[PDB]
Amino acid sequence: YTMSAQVIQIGRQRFVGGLFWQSLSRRNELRAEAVELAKKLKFDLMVLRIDRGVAAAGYANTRDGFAPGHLSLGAMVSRAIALEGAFYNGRRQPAPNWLGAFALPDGRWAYFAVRDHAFMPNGDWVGSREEALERLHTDYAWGGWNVVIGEPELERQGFQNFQPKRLDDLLPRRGGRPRTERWWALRPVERRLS
Ligand SMILES: [K+]
Ligand SMILES: [K+]
Ligand SMILES: [K+]
Ligand SMILES: [K+]
Ligand SMILES: [K+]
């Protein structure tokens, strides 16, 4: 019972970071494949991230402090960036390869790393500002990134292509009111009886 997950309260919405991300084959019904992989990888909770650019599952375990109904912060940010792209190499365009770090309302930071529109396996992390920046710089060294998207203060880091962005800018809304999309929610991975 590691209980490493701590909910992120953003207004009325309860988000989580730290899912394990698994790209799917695209050869089988995506949900059924995701369920099979969850059993093998030993996770009892999942979210599906599906659109024209991605077919992936984000996984967690109840024993690690995650729960059905927790909203995937990664799912939200991933889709938001899929929708708006980013400015890099002289134009606003889709950004398949992006990294970012965002300040959270309680002082923690979220770190994201996405390649070919899909999260890297551990590219969804929440913790201290210092460790988030450390992870950011570490993945950045690999190269092949379109853009760094995140907290405006990261301007100062001197990344080649930087896109300032706050989580608040990305949340979908009803006028001023944040909307929750149901698909962000972790749901139980159904298992047959033995
Ligand atoms: K994976
Ligand atoms: K796979
Ligand atoms: K494949
Ligand atoms: K997440
Ligand atoms: K995406």
Residue numbers in the entry: -1 to 192
What does the paper say about this structure?
We here-report work carried out on PilO2Bp, a component of the Tfpb R64 thin pilus variant assembly machinery from B. pseudomallei. We show that N-PilO2Bp consists of two α/β sub-domains separated by a prominent central cleft, typical of actin-like ATPases. The function of PilO2 within the Tfpb assembly machinery is not documented, however, PilO2 is reported to be an assembly protein that localizes in the cytoplasm in the absence of other Pil proteins, translocating to the OM in their presence. FFPred, from the PSIPRED website, predicted the most plausible topology, with a cytoplasmic localization for the N-terminal domain (1-194), a transmembrane domain (195-214), and a periplasmic localization for the C-terminal domain (215-432).
Moreover, we report the 1.55 Å crystal structure of the N-terminal domain of PilO2Bp (residues 1-192; N-PilO2Bp), solved by S-SAD phasing, providing a first glimpse of the 3D structural properties of the PF06864 family, previously lacking a structure representative. Thus, considering the availability of 1.5 Å resolution data for this protein, the single-wavelength anomalous diffraction (SAD) phasing method was adopted based on the four intrinsic sulphur atoms present in native N-PliO2Bp. Four sulphur and one phosphor anomalous scatterers were located during the phasing procedure. The N-PilO2Bp 3D structure was then refined using data at 1.55 Å resolution, to R-free and R-factor values of 0.186 and 0.223, respectively (for further information see Materials and Methods). The first ‘dimeric’ interface, results from the interaction of two N-PilO2Bp molecules via a phosphate ion. Indeed, the identified phosphate ion is located in a pocket in the C-terminal region, interacting with Arg61, Arg189 and Asp42. In the crystal, the phosphate ion further interacts with Arg50 and Arg77 of a symmetry-related molecule. Considering the location of the expected transmembrane segment that follows N-PilO2Bp C-terminal residues, such positively charged surface may help the protein interact with a phosphate from IM phospholipid head groups. The second crystal packing dimer is built around an ‘anchor loop’ that covers residues 168-179. This loop was refined with higher than average B-factors, suggesting conformational flexibility that may mediate PilO2Bp interaction/recognition with other assembly machinery partners.
